[PDB]
Design a protein around this ligand. Structure first.
Ligand SMILES: CN1CCC[C@H]1c1cccnc1
Lengths: 188, 182
């Protein structure tokens, strides 16, 4: 439909380009739109009419279109630019709005960070809550009745996860071991 | 942002209904995003009345606009698990006064298609923070009294099919699908 690379990366202070490839019936004959989407928020329109910025959008974002291809350019990259970017256009043969698959833009240069770990005891039942925050890169290992979340990107572009050990009050010291880049911390 | 409303839980085979408030515009439409996936166009209605739908949603979509009451609406009938997504309403204005390229989006409403019942969460103190456990469906929102040092973590889905999450400060729990405030 509209095809975008799944991934891009850029360096703070530098530039990135995100491509969007379509056909004569869409990009070839209609205006291209570009969106920035941060996780868990609505898309925000960055570009309309191929190359125009809505009021309020920084001039660091620019757009262009040649034949059946379009590109979003971002200069003076900052960490907060880390987001999913989508292209969109009307398609004449389909009579439909079509969207690109999105390009996940990652911003390089983040230092390694050890996880902040907090373990809460139980306050009828018993749940041990291990909370893991502010780590980078976004992978950790935690060590019956264990349920551990996948790593999710925080709004500051570091990572978080939580682990939950379910026990009966009769079963209930206990320890949460969090491993990140060979380094393990225990809470008890 | 546009004010988007409607239930966050729909049973399979029943109808999903959402509404947004908007003053004016040129095109009103709906877009959705399944968990971990891209943006999918549902349908658009133009100020002409011309209306267009995603053909894969066969005969299941109905969109409408009532400009005189400042609203537009989506109905999606006969839903299945495949219709679980965050749904957005969108209103295109374009170049307005001095303003240019105006497009407004609803905040996004998670609709989960499931035959399981709503279940309000049980809230327990962490000592600091709060534990919000055994609820369905998503989401819960947690506020305190305080905005600094507050970290609310994404929920875990336990083997019971129920969710749990925790919010920490370095609590006002709200579960709209069960209408519970702790
Ligand atoms: C003009 N917008 C650009 C991409 C989506 C499109 C739009 C907005 C509102 C209703 N339908 C389509």
């Amino acid at each position: 439909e509209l095809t975008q690379p799944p991934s891009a990366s850029g360096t703070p202070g530098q530039r990135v380009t995100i491509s969007c490839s379509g056909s004569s019936s869409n990009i070839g004959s209609n205006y291209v739109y570009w969106y920035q989407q941060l996780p868990g928020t609505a898309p925000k329109l960055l570009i309309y009419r191929n190359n125009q910025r809505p009021s309020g959008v920084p001039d660091r974002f620019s757009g262009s279109k040649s034949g059946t291809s379009a590109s979003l350019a971002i200069s003076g990259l900052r960490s907060e630019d880390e987001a999913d970017y989508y292209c969109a256009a009307w398609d004449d043969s389909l009579s439909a709005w079509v969207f690109g698959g999105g390009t996940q833009l990652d911003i390089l240069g983040q230092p390694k960070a050890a996880p902040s770990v907090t373990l809460f005891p139980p306050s009828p039942k018993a749940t041990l809550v291990c909370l893991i925050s502010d780590f980078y890169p976004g992978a950790v290992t935690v060590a019956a009745g264990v349920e551990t979340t996948t790593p999710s990107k925080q709004s500051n572009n570091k990572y978080a996860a939580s682990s939950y050990l379910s026990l009966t009050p009769e079963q209930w010291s206990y320890s949460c071991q969090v491993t990140h880049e060979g380094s393990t911390v225990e809470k008890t | 942002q546009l004010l988007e409303s409607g239930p966050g839980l729909v049973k399979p085979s029943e109808t999903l209904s959402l509404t947004c408030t908007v003053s004016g515009g040129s095109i009103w439409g709906w877009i959705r995003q399944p968990p971990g996936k891209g943006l999918e166009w549902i349908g658009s209605i133009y100020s002409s009345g011309s209306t267009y739908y995603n053909p894969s949603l066969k005969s299941r979509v109905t969109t409408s606009v009532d400009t005189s009451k400042n609203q537009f609406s989506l109905r999606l009938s006969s839903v299945t698990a495949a219709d679980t997504a965050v749904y957005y309403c969108v209103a295109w204005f374009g170049d307005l006064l001095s303003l240019k390229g105006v497009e407004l989006w609803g905040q996004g409403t998670l609709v989960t298609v499931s035959s399981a019942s709503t279940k309000g969460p049980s809230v327990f103190p962490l000592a600091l923070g709060c534990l919000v456990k055994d609820y369905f469906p998503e989401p819960v929102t947690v506020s305190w009294n305080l905005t600094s040092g507050v970290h609310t973590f994404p929920a875990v889905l336990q083997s019971s099919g129920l969710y749990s999450l925790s919010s920490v400060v370095t609590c006002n729990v709200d579960h709209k699908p069960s209408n519970t405030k702790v």
